[PDB]
PDB file of all heavy atoms in Angstrom:
ATOM      1  N   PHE V 635     -31.055   3.924 -56.247  1.00 17.60           N
ATOM      2  CA  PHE V 635     -31.220   3.959 -54.798  1.00 17.60           C
ATOM      3  C   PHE V 635     -31.144   2.558 -54.204  1.00 17.60           C
ATOM      4  O   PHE V 635     -30.485   2.339 -53.181  1.00 17.60           O
ATOM      5  CB  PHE V 635     -32.547   4.627 -54.440  1.00 17.60           C
ATOM      6  N   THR V 636     -31.818   1.592 -54.835  1.00 17.17           N
ATOM      7  CA  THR V 636     -31.755   0.216 -54.355  1.00 17.17           C
ATOM      8  C   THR V 636     -30.337  -0.335 -54.448  1.00 17.17           C
ATOM      9  O   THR V 636     -29.868  -1.023 -53.532  1.00 17.17           O
ATOM     10  CB  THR V 636     -32.723  -0.663 -55.146  1.00 17.17           C
ATOM     11  N   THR V 637     -29.633  -0.033 -55.543  1.00 22.41           N
ATOM     12  CA  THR V 637     -28.262  -0.509 -55.692  1.00 22.41           C
ATOM     13  C   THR V 637     -27.348   0.098 -54.636  1.00 22.41           C
ATOM     14  O   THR V 637     -26.497  -0.596 -54.068  1.00 22.41           O
ATOM     15  CB  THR V 637     -27.743  -0.189 -57.094  1.00 22.41           C
ATOM     16  N   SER V 638     -27.517   1.390 -54.346  1.00 23.13           N
ATOM     17  CA  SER V 638     -26.685   2.035 -53.336  1.00 23.13           C
ATOM     18  C   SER V 638     -26.997   1.503 -51.942  1.00 23.13           C
ATOM     19  O   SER V 638     -26.089   1.340 -51.119  1.00 23.13           O
ATOM     20  CB  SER V 638     -26.875   3.550 -53.391  1.00 23.13           C
ATOM     21  N   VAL V 639     -28.271   1.218 -51.661  1.00 23.50           N
ATOM     22  CA  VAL V 639     -28.630   0.638 -50.370  1.00 23.50           C
ATOM     23  C   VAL V 639     -28.018  -0.749 -50.224  1.00 23.50           C
ATOM     24  O   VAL V 639     -27.483  -1.102 -49.164  1.00 23.50           O
ATOM     25  CB  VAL V 639     -30.160   0.602 -50.207  1.00 23.50           C
ATOM     26  N   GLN V 640     -28.079  -1.556 -51.287  1.00 26.17           N
ATOM     27  CA  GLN V 640     -27.470  -2.881 -51.242  1.00 26.17           C
ATOM     28  C   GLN V 640     -25.959  -2.788 -51.065  1.00 26.17           C
ATOM     29  O   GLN V 640     -25.363  -3.580 -50.325  1.00 26.17           O
ATOM     30  CB  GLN V 640     -27.815  -3.660 -52.512  1.00 26.17           C
ATOM     31  N   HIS V 641     -25.324  -1.818 -51.726  1.00 22.98           N
ATOM     32  CA  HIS V 641     -23.881  -1.649 -51.587  1.00 22.98           C
ATOM     33  C   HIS V 641     -23.508  -1.221 -50.174  1.00 22.98           C
ATOM     34  O   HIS V 641     -22.510  -1.695 -49.619  1.00 22.98           O
ATOM     35  CB  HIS V 641     -23.371  -0.634 -52.609  1.00 22.98           C
ATOM     36  N   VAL V 642     -24.297  -0.325 -49.575  1.00 24.16           N
ATOM     37  CA  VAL V 642     -24.032   0.097 -48.203  1.00 24.16           C
ATOM     38  C   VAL V 642     -24.206  -1.073 -47.244  1.00 24.16           C
ATOM     39  O   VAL V 642     -23.416  -1.250 -46.308  1.00 24.16           O
ATOM     40  CB  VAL V 642     -24.940   1.282 -47.823  1.00 24.16           C
ATOM     41  N   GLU V 643     -25.238  -1.892 -47.463  1.00 22.49           N
ATOM     42  CA  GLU V 643     -25.435  -3.066 -46.618  1.00 22.49           C
ATOM     43  C   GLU V 643     -24.277  -4.045 -46.758  1.00 22.49           C
ATOM     44  O   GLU V 643     -23.804  -4.608 -45.762  1.00 22.49           O
ATOM     45  CB  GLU V 643     -26.759  -3.747 -46.967  1.00 22.49           C
ATOM     46  N   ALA V 644     -23.798  -4.254 -47.987  1.00 20.67           N
ATOM     47  CA  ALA V 644     -22.674  -5.158 -48.201  1.00 20.67           C
ATOM     48  C   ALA V 644     -21.406  -4.629 -47.543  1.00 20.67           C
ATOM     49  O   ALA V 644     -20.642  -5.394 -46.947  1.00 20.67           O
ATOM     50  CB  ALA V 644     -22.452  -5.374 -49.698  1.00 20.67           C
ATOM     51  N   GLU V 645     -21.170  -3.318 -47.638  1.00 22.40           N
ATOM     52  CA  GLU V 645     -19.994  -2.732 -47.003  1.00 22.40           C
ATOM     53  C   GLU V 645     -20.072  -2.849 -45.487  1.00 22.40           C
ATOM     54  O   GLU V 645     -19.070  -3.147 -44.827  1.00 22.40           O
ATOM     55  CB  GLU V 645     -19.845  -1.270 -47.422  1.00 22.40           C
ATOM     56  N   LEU V 646     -21.258  -2.619 -44.916  1.00 20.36           N
ATOM     57  CA  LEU V 646     -21.423  -2.772 -43.475  1.00 20.36           C
ATOM     58  C   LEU V 646     -21.186  -4.214 -43.045  1.00 20.36           C
ATOM     59  O   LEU V 646     -20.522  -4.467 -42.032  1.00 20.36           O
ATOM     60  CB  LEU V 646     -22.816  -2.307 -43.053  1.00 20.36           C
ATOM     61  N   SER V 647     -21.715  -5.175 -43.809  1.00 23.24           N
ATOM     62  CA  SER V 647     -21.512  -6.580 -43.471  1.00 23.24           C
ATOM     63  C   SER V 647     -20.042  -6.967 -43.577  1.00 23.24           C
ATOM     64  O   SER V 647     -19.530  -7.725 -42.746  1.00 23.24           O
ATOM     65  CB  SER V 647     -22.366  -7.466 -44.376  1.00 23.24           C
ATOM     66  N   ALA V 648     -19.343  -6.449 -44.591  1.00 20.47           N
ATOM     67  CA  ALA V 648     -17.926  -6.757 -44.742  1.00 20.47           C
ATOM     68  C   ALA V 648     -17.105  -6.152 -43.610  1.00 20.47           C
ATOM     69  O   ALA V 648     -16.195  -6.801 -43.081  1.00 20.47           O
ATOM     70  CB  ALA V 648     -17.422  -6.260 -46.096  1.00 20.47           C
ATOM     71  N   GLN V 649     -17.409  -4.910 -43.227  1.00 21.48           N
ATOM     72  CA  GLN V 649     -16.698  -4.287 -42.117  1.00 21.48           C
ATOM     73  C   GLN V 649     -16.972  -5.007 -40.806  1.00 21.48           C
ATOM     74  O   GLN V 649     -16.070  -5.144 -39.972  1.00 21.48           O
ATOM     75  CB  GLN V 649     -17.083  -2.811 -42.006  1.00 21.48           C
ATOM     76  N   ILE V 650     -18.206  -5.476 -40.604  1.00 23.95           N
ATOM     77  CA  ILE V 650     -18.517  -6.228 -39.395  1.00 23.95           C
ATOM     78  C   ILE V 650     -17.822  -7.581 -39.410  1.00 23.95           C
ATOM     79  O   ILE V 650     -17.430  -8.097 -38.356  1.00 23.95           O
ATOM     80  CB  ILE V 650     -20.041  -6.377 -39.236  1.00 23.95           C
ATOM     81  N   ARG V 651     -17.653  -8.175 -40.589  1.00 25.16           N
ATOM     82  CA  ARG V 651     -16.944  -9.447 -40.724  1.00 25.16           C
ATOM     83  C   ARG V 651     -15.446  -9.199 -40.907  1.00 25.16           C
ATOM     84  O   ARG V 651     -14.832  -9.562 -41.910  1.00 25.16           O
ATOM     85  CB  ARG V 651     -17.521 -10.254 -41.881  1.00 25.16           C
ATOM     86  N   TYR V 652     -14.862  -8.557 -39.900  1.00 26.34           N
ATOM     87  CA  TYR V 652     -13.447  -8.234 -39.914  1.00 26.34           C
ATOM     88  C   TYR V 652     -12.675  -9.355 -39.218  1.00 26.34           C
ATOM     89  O   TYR V 652     -13.254 -10.283 -38.651  1.00 26.34           O
ATOM     90  CB  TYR V 652     -13.227  -6.869 -39.263  1.00 26.34           C
ATOM     91  CG  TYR V 652     -11.826  -6.308 -39.383  1.00 26.34           C
ATOM     92  CD1 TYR V 652     -11.358  -5.808 -40.593  1.00 26.34           C
ATOM     93  CD2 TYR V 652     -10.984  -6.249 -38.283  1.00 26.34           C
ATOM     94  CE1 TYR V 652     -10.082  -5.285 -40.706  1.00 26.34           C
ATOM     95  CE2 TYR V 652      -9.706  -5.727 -38.386  1.00 26.34           C
ATOM     96  CZ  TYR V 652      -9.261  -5.246 -39.600  1.00 26.34           C
ATOM     97  OH  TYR V 652      -7.991  -4.725 -39.707  1.00 26.34           O
ATOM     98  N   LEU V 653     -11.344  -9.263 -39.249  1.00 30.52           N
ATOM     99  CA  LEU V 653     -10.510 -10.349 -38.747  1.00 30.52           C
ATOM    100  C   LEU V 653     -10.626 -10.537 -37.241  1.00 30.52           C
ATOM    101  O   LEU V 653     -10.187 -11.572 -36.728  1.00 30.52           O
ATOM    102  CB  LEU V 653      -9.047 -10.108 -39.126  1.00 30.52           C
ATOM    103  N   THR V 654     -11.194  -9.564 -36.522  1.00 27.99           N
ATOM    104  CA  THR V 654     -11.381  -9.645 -35.072  1.00 27.99           C
ATOM    105  C   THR V 654     -10.037  -9.874 -34.372  1.00 27.99           C
ATOM    106  O   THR V 654      -9.775 -10.924 -33.781  1.00 27.99           O
ATOM    107  CB  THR V 654     -12.395 -10.736 -34.706  1.00 27.99           C
ATOM    108  N   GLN V 655      -9.191  -8.846 -34.479  1.00 28.21           N
ATOM    109  CA  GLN V 655      -7.783  -8.919 -34.102  1.00 28.21           C
ATOM    110  C   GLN V 655      -7.540  -9.655 -32.786  1.00 28.21           C
ATOM    111  O   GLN V 655      -6.808 -10.650 -32.746  1.00 28.21           O
ATOM    112  CB  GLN V 655      -7.207  -7.501 -34.032  1.00 28.21           C
ATOM    113  N   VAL V 656      -8.140  -9.181 -31.694  1.00 27.76           N
ATOM    114  CA  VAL V 656      -7.893  -9.789 -30.391  1.00 27.76           C
ATOM    115  C   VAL V 656      -9.195 -10.271 -29.765  1.00 27.76           C
ATOM    116  O   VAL V 656      -9.414 -11.479 -29.618  1.00 27.76           O
ATOM    117  CB  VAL V 656      -7.172  -8.804 -29.454  1.00 27.76           C
ATOM    118  N   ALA V 657     -10.065  -9.329 -29.394  1.00 27.20           N
ATOM    119  CA  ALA V 657     -11.343  -9.627 -28.744  1.00 27.20           C
ATOM    120  C   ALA V 657     -11.168 -10.470 -27.481  1.00 27.20           C
ATOM    121  O   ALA V 657     -12.089 -11.177 -27.063  1.00 27.20           O
ATOM    122  CB  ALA V 657     -12.313 -10.313 -29.711  1.00 27.20           C
ATOM    123  N   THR V 658      -9.994 -10.410 -26.864  1.00 27.41           N
ATOM    124  CA  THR V 658      -9.727 -11.174 -25.649  1.00 27.41           C
ATOM    125  C   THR V 658      -9.202 -10.316 -24.509  1.00 27.41           C
ATOM    126  O   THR V 658      -9.540 -10.570 -23.350  1.00 27.41           O
ATOM    127  CB  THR V 658      -8.728 -12.304 -25.943  1.00 27.41           C
ATOM    128  N   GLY V 659      -8.384  -9.311 -24.806  1.00 25.82           N
ATOM    129  CA  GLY V 659      -7.855  -8.428 -23.788  1.00 25.82           C
ATOM    130  C   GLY V 659      -7.427  -7.126 -24.426  1.00 25.82           C
ATOM    131  O   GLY V 659      -7.580  -6.921 -25.631  1.00 25.82           O
ATOM    132  N   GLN V 660      -6.891  -6.237 -23.594  1.00 25.51           N
ATOM    133  CA  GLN V 660      -6.404  -4.949 -24.070  1.00 25.51           C
ATOM    134  C   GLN V 660      -5.210  -5.159 -24.992  1.00 25.51           C
ATOM    135  O   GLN V 660      -4.133  -5.558 -24.532  1.00 25.51           O
ATOM    136  CB  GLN V 660      -6.024  -4.046 -22.897  1.00 25.51           C
ATOM    137  N   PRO V 661      -5.355  -4.903 -26.287  1.00 27.33           N
ATOM    138  CA  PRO V 661      -4.275  -5.179 -27.234  1.00 27.33           C
ATOM    139  C   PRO V 661      -3.356  -3.975 -27.411  1.00 27.33           C
ATOM    140  O   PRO V 661      -3.652  -2.860 -26.974  1.00 27.33           O
ATOM    141  CB  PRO V 661      -5.028  -5.489 -28.539  1.00 27.33           C
ATOM    142  CG  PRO V 661      -6.472  -5.019 -28.311  1.00 27.33           C
ATOM    143  CD  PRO V 661      -6.534  -4.350 -26.967  1.00 27.33           C
ATOM    144  N   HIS V 662      -2.226  -4.230 -28.073  1.00 22.43           N
ATOM    145  CA  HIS V 662      -1.225  -3.203 -28.363  1.00 22.43           C
ATOM    146  C   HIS V 662      -0.787  -2.482 -27.091  1.00 22.43           C
ATOM    147  O   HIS V 662      -0.669  -1.255 -27.059  1.00 22.43           O
ATOM    148  CB  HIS V 662      -1.741  -2.208 -29.405  1.00 22.43           C
ATOM    149  N   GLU V 663      -0.544  -3.250 -26.032  1.00 18.78           N
ATOM    150  CA  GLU V 663      -0.169  -2.671 -24.751  1.00 18.78           C
ATOM    151  C   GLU V 663       1.246  -2.111 -24.820  1.00 18.78           C
ATOM    152  O   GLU V 663       2.185  -2.813 -25.208  1.00 18.78           O
ATOM    153  CB  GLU V 663      -0.285  -3.716 -23.642  1.00 18.78           C
ATOM    154  CG  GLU V 663       0.309  -5.069 -23.989  1.00 18.78           C
ATOM    155  CD  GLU V 663      -0.001  -6.120 -22.946  1.00 18.78           C
ATOM    156  OE1 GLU V 663      -1.180  -6.237 -22.552  1.00 18.78           O
ATOM    157  OE2 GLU V 663       0.933  -6.828 -22.517  1.00 18.78           O
ATOM    158  N   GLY V 664       1.392  -0.844 -24.447  1.00 20.81           N
ATOM    159  CA  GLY V 664       2.672  -0.168 -24.492  1.00 20.81           C
ATOM    160  C   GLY V 664       2.792   0.766 -25.677  1.00 20.81           C
ATOM    161  O   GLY V 664       3.047   0.326 -26.802  1.00 20.81           O
ATOM    162  N   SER V 665       2.605   2.058 -25.439  1.00 20.19           N
ATOM    163  CA  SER V 665       2.677   3.065 -26.497  1.00 20.19           C
ATOM    164  C   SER V 665       4.021   3.778 -26.505  1.00 20.19           C
ATOM    165  O   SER V 665       4.081   5.008 -26.505  1.00 20.19           O
ATOM    166  CB  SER V 665       1.534   4.060 -26.347  1.00 20.19           C
ATOM    167  N   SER V 666       5.111   3.012 -26.517  1.00 19.64           N
ATOM    168  CA  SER V 666       6.461   3.565 -26.634  1.00 19.64           C
ATOM    169  C   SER V 666       6.732   4.626 -25.569  1.00 19.64           C
ATOM    170  O   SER V 666       7.256   5.703 -25.857  1.00 19.64           O
ATOM    171  CB  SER V 666       6.699   4.136 -28.033  1.00 19.64           C
ATOM    172  N   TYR V 667       6.361   4.321 -24.324  1.00 15.87           N
ATOM    173  CA  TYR V 667       6.561   5.283 -23.246  1.00 15.87           C
ATOM    174  C   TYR V 667       8.037   5.553 -23.001  1.00 15.87           C
ATOM    175  O   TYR V 667       8.406   6.660 -22.591  1.00 15.87           O
ATOM    176  CB  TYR V 667       5.894   4.781 -21.968  1.00 15.87           C
ATOM    177  CG  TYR V 667       4.516   5.351 -21.748  1.00 15.87           C
ATOM    178  CD1 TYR V 667       3.391   4.548 -21.844  1.00 15.87           C
ATOM    179  CD2 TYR V 667       4.341   6.693 -21.445  1.00 15.87           C
ATOM    180  CE1 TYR V 667       2.131   5.065 -21.644  1.00 15.87           C
ATOM    181  CE2 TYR V 667       3.084   7.220 -21.243  1.00 15.87           C
ATOM    182  CZ  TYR V 667       1.983   6.401 -21.344  1.00 15.87           C
ATOM    183  OH  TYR V 667       0.726   6.922 -21.143  1.00 15.87           O
ATOM    184  N   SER V 668       8.894   4.560 -23.248  1.00 17.24           N
ATOM    185  CA  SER V 668      10.328   4.765 -23.077  1.00 17.24           C
ATOM    186  C   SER V 668      10.843   5.844 -24.020  1.00 17.24           C
ATOM    187  O   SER V 668      11.623   6.714 -23.612  1.00 17.24           O
ATOM    188  CB  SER V 668      11.071   3.450 -23.302  1.00 17.24           C
ATOM    189  OG  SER V 668      10.411   2.379 -22.651  1.00 17.24           O
ATOM    190  N   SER V 669      10.415   5.806 -25.284  1.00 10.76           N
ATOM    191  CA  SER V 669      10.826   6.838 -26.229  1.00 10.76           C
ATOM    192  C   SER V 669      10.283   8.204 -25.834  1.00 10.76           C
ATOM    193  O   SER V 669      10.974   9.217 -25.993  1.00 10.76           O
ATOM    194  CB  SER V 669      10.366   6.471 -27.639  1.00 10.76           C
ATOM    195  N   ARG V 670       9.053   8.252 -25.318  1.00  9.81           N
ATOM    196  CA  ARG V 670       8.495   9.517 -24.850  1.00  9.81           C
ATOM    197  C   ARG V 670       9.339  10.098 -23.726  1.00  9.81           C
ATOM    198  O   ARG V 670       9.668  11.290 -23.728  1.00  9.81           O
ATOM    199  CB  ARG V 670       7.051   9.311 -24.392  1.00  9.81           C
ATOM    200  CG  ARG V 670       6.323  10.592 -24.026  1.00  9.81           C
ATOM    201  CD  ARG V 670       5.933  11.379 -25.264  1.00  9.81           C
ATOM    202  NE  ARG V 670       5.539  12.749 -24.946  1.00  9.81           N
ATOM    203  CZ  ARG V 670       6.342  13.802 -25.052  1.00  9.81           C
ATOM    204  NH1 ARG V 670       7.590  13.646 -25.469  1.00  9.81           N
ATOM    205  NH2 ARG V 670       5.897  15.011 -24.741  1.00  9.81           N
ATOM    206  N   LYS V 671       9.708   9.261 -22.756  1.00  7.67           N
ATOM    207  CA  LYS V 671      10.521   9.741 -21.645  1.00  7.67           C
ATOM    208  C   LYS V 671      11.903  10.168 -22.119  1.00  7.67           C
ATOM    209  O   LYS V 671      12.455  11.163 -21.632  1.00  7.67           O
ATOM    210  CB  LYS V 671      10.630   8.663 -20.569  1.00  7.67           C
ATOM    211  CG  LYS V 671      11.319   9.142 -19.311  1.00  7.67           C
ATOM    212  CD  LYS V 671      10.632  10.384 -18.778  1.00  7.67           C
ATOM    213  CE  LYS V 671      11.090  10.712 -17.376  1.00  7.67           C
ATOM    214  NZ  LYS V 671      12.540  11.023 -17.311  1.00  7.67           N
ATOM    215  N   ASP V 672      12.480   9.432 -23.071  1.00  2.91           N
ATOM    216  CA  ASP V 672      13.786   9.807 -23.602  1.00  2.91           C
ATOM    217  C   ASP V 672      13.722  11.162 -24.298  1.00  2.91           C
ATOM    218  O   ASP V 672      14.612  12.003 -24.130  1.00  2.91           O
ATOM    219  CB  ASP V 672      14.289   8.727 -24.561  1.00  2.91           C
ATOM    220  N   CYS V 673      12.668  11.390 -25.084  1.00  2.00           N
ATOM    221  CA  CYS V 673      12.512  12.681 -25.745  1.00  2.00           C
ATOM    222  C   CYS V 673      12.305  13.796 -24.729  1.00  2.00           C
ATOM    223  O   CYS V 673      12.822  14.907 -24.902  1.00  2.00           O
ATOM    224  CB  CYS V 673      11.347  12.627 -26.732  1.00  2.00           C
ATOM    225  N   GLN V 674      11.556  13.518 -23.661  1.00  2.00           N
ATOM    226  CA  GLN V 674      11.361  14.518 -22.616  1.00  2.00           C
ATOM    227  C   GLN V 674      12.684  14.878 -21.955  1.00  2.00           C
ATOM    228  O   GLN V 674      12.974  16.056 -21.712  1.00  2.00           O
ATOM    229  CB  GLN V 674      10.363  14.003 -21.580  1.00  2.00           C
ATOM    230  CG  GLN V 674       8.929  13.963 -22.073  1.00  2.00           C
ATOM    231  CD  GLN V 674       8.078  12.975 -21.301  1.00  2.00           C
ATOM    232  OE1 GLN V 674       8.536  12.369 -20.332  1.00  2.00           O
ATOM    233  NE2 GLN V 674       6.833  12.808 -21.726  1.00  2.00           N
ATOM    234  N   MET V 675      13.508  13.870 -21.665  1.00  2.00           N
ATOM    235  CA  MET V 675      14.807  14.139 -21.059  1.00  2.00           C
ATOM    236  C   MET V 675      15.722  14.893 -22.012  1.00  2.00           C
ATOM    237  O   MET V 675      16.484  15.762 -21.576  1.00  2.00           O
ATOM    238  CB  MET V 675      15.466  12.837 -20.609  1.00  2.00           C
ATOM    239  CG  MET V 675      14.659  12.062 -19.588  1.00  2.00           C
ATOM    240  SD  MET V 675      13.509  13.106 -18.673  1.00  2.00           S
ATOM    241  CE  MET V 675      14.597  13.837 -17.455  1.00  2.00           C
TER     242      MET V 675
END
């Protein structure tokens, strides 16, 4: 139980210590709307 708790804590800390992709603005702007409209047409 102690080992599993320590492993869960380590996994949570590692996930929190992620690369922090942007953290400045709305990222990945543009979800291929042109292709969506082309498929609709």
Side-chain angles (χ1 to χ4, degrees), residues 644 648 652 657 659 661 663-664 667-668 670-671 674-675:
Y652 188 73
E663 45 188 48
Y667 264 111
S668 316
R670 186 75 194 98
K671 187 55 167 63
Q674 288 157 5
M675 300 337 280

